């Protein structure tokens, strides 16, 4: 595979495109508390399919700062687009760069993320006026590749993930009309199918710790690069994506652990998770779903290419997992078919949910990768190892 197209960054324009008349672009300054207001606003009411949605996503500064300003962030990459007399924030756009790895080629790309249109100027087609603008301010700026994952069907998609979903909380995800109640079942058989354990099971799993930063670092390393599409962490972006800073981050966004060998004192296998929450839209019992999404995680166990025994090793990790996302009072543990995550998905009670996340890159060819289901869109053992990326 290979790039699509070569791009010359002195011949591109040093001047964004025209955008509908009464509308300007502006570059966001997360690091000013008033425009930081001003995205998570946008995102708030307007990171929505449309008005009939049943949930609105609520974001927090410290989950904008966690999505947004990781290592390398720059703000010409926050983008966004005003009301030029009201100065009202309509619409943005975001990337952040990092490096992933396309089938042992070593690539620098960008992953956007943040689309979002106010929703009152839906179907104006502002939407590839804002993609071309961060694509010229990522190509004036070293990049031409990206990776981004979109629900919508985009020609050639790299990879296709099916959402799942484990219910920590059944009940309230059948009250808030998430999760159906199947059959002739009823609410408590439904409760009892999804009761977790109150403790954990892996020997000397214990929340990770900044001295944990290289040695998980490594064993992510080794455990992705087994995936044709992967991301090739640096140091930096273990450290900010994976090790929660309570003294600087308000709300904690992500939770990992780290499992310590009793006998070696060497960590074995970690995995994390990150809270994003669901604003429940005017029901009458709950307004917010707690959500965990499952985010990186590794295990040595992988090593050994016995698929019986990792399939072993990540059904008690990832149980604990839910165990104790559970325990901090989640709702609902949300995951894709990506990883070795068909390995324990279904076992572990998660949800086939409606679809699939399309994975695509921009100006980067390359054969679709499988992204742990077969062609029923069913989880498949023998579809994993391409996906060894997540994003937010
Ligand atoms: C080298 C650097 C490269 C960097 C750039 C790499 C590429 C990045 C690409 C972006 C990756 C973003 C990753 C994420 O953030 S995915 C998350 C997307 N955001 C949301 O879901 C928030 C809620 N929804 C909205 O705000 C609106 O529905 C949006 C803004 C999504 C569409 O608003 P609207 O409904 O008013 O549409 P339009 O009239 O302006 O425009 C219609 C055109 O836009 C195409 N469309 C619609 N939805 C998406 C979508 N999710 N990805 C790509 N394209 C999309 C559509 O097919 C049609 O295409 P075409 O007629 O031109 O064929
Ligand atoms: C989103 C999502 C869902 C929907 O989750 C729920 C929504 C409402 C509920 F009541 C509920 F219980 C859910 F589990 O289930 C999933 C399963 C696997 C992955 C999922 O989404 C992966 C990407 C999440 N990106 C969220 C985002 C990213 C950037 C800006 N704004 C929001 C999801
Ligand atoms: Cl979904």
């Not at 995102?43 to 949930?55: G, K, P, Q, R, S």
């Amino acid at each position: 595979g290979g790039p699509i197209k070569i791009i010359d960054p002195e011949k591109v324009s040093k001047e964004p495109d025209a955008l509908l008349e009464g509308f300007e672009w502006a570059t966001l300054d997360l690091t000013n508390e008033t425009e930081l207001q001003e995205l998570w606003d946008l995102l708030t009411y307007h990171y929505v399919e449309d008005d009939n949605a049943m949930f609105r996503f609520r974001y927090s500064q410290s989950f904008l700062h966690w999505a947004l300003m990781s290592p390398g962030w720059k703000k010409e990459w926050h983008v966004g687009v005003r009301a030029t007399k009201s100065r009202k924030l309509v619409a943005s756009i975001c990337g952040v760069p990092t490096e992933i790895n396309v089938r042992n080629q070593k690539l620098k790309v960008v992953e956007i993320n943040f689309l979002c249109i106010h929703k009152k100027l839906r179907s104006k087609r502002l939407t590839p006026v804002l993609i071309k603008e961060i694509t010229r301010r990522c190509y004036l700026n070293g990049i031409y590749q990206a990776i981004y994952t979109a629900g919508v069907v985009l020609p050639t998609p790299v990879s296709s993930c099916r959402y799942y979903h484990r219910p920590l909380d059944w009940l309230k995800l059948y009250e808030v009309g998430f999760s159906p109640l199947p059959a002739g079942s009823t609410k408590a058989r439904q409760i009892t199918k999804n009761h977790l354990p109150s403790t954990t099971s892996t020997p000397g799993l214990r929340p990770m710790e900044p001295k944990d930063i290289d040695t998980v670092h490594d064993l992510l390393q080794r455990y992705l690069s087994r995936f044709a599409l992967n991301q090739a962490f640096t140091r930096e972006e273990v450290d900010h994506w994976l090790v929660h800073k309570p003294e600087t981050v308000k709300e904690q966004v992500v939770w990992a652990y780290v499992v310590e060998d009793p006998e070696t004192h060497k960590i074995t296998d970690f995995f994390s998770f990150y809270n994003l929450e669901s604003t429940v839209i005017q029901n009458p019992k709950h307004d917010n779903v707690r959500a965990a999404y499952l985010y990186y995680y590794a295990t040595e166990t992988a090593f050994t290419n016995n698929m019986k025994a990792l399939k072993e090793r990540l059904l008690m990790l990832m149980n604990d997992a839910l165990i104790l996302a559970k325990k901090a009072h989640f709702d609902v543990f949300n995951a894709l078919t990506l990883h070795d995550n068909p390995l324990f998905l279904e076992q572990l009670k998660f949800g086939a949910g409606d679809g699939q996340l399309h994975f695509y890159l921009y100006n980067y060819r390359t054969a679709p990768v499988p992204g742990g289901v077969n062609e029923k869109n069913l989880p498949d053992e023998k579809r994993m190892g391409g996906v060894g990326i997540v994003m937010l």
